Amino acid sequence: MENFQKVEKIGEGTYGVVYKARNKLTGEVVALKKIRTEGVPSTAIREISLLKELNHPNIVKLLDVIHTENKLYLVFEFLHQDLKKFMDASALTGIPLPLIKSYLFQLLQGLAFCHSHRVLHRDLKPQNLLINTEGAIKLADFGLARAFGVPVRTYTHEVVTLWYRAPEILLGCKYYSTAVDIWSLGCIFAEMVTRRALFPGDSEIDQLFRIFRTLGTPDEVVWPGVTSMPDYKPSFPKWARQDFSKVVPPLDEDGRSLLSQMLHYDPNKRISAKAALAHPFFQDVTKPVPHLRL
């Protein structure tokens, strides 16, 4: 990559290292990602290349896909900060509600766009939601989970987080619907409000039981077909459902209503991104600018 001048390391992703770099010919500043492999499957190349046309203001733009010397490089639009770092930096006082609302509204717009084109993300987390000084937030890595799969550990052996994984995935479902992304965004929404992760599991069963302890152990009444799922066991403990007023205080009733619909157990009934954009919670939405010291 002598076409790019490395400025500095941004971090370590799931599949490889990420660098901030400058296009020596156009002066463009970008994010360069190296991806895991005896030559890279051809099926993955075709799938990823189609993503170059999935353009929207709330989706991080894929500039180029380069396969050479059996290595894979993805060139992306560059943004200065990610939501995980912003949340940590905002721990003492918390992110103001008008900004939490603006970010959720924008994220739902990005999901509605991708979902209308039959593309899901499958592994949303604060670390892949990027922000700028203008008040915008964008979703990164849409479509990569399908092409490469989601591993148990990263290329550096770090544990891939389970905190935002939908229950149907944990129970062994073979086919994923767009509902899996709505679940993840709901968990992220709750974390911005309370300043603590909603379901911080440290194993697949710990993650599932934390969900059950808060929302109640699911049954055929709320989730038709749950007892027939691949990893369901009749021996699961039976916990009672808790009140949202206790789960996400001090969020108002419009906010609690919307979150409850984003965390519905049955994937077929969970609210869609398009329907969520019309929820009363967004009646007074605005576009504030965050305080960023770069």
Ligand SMILES: NC(=O)c1cc([N+](=O)[O-])c(N2CCC(N)CC2)cc1NCc1cnc(N)nc1
């Ligand atoms: N497209 C991008 O500009 C971008 C891409 C990735 N990525 O390709 O993953 C990324 N992460 C790397 C792996 C980390 N575990 C999570 C965040 C961060 C980005 N930008 C925000 C940012 C810029 N600079 C610094 N120092 N920190 C954050």
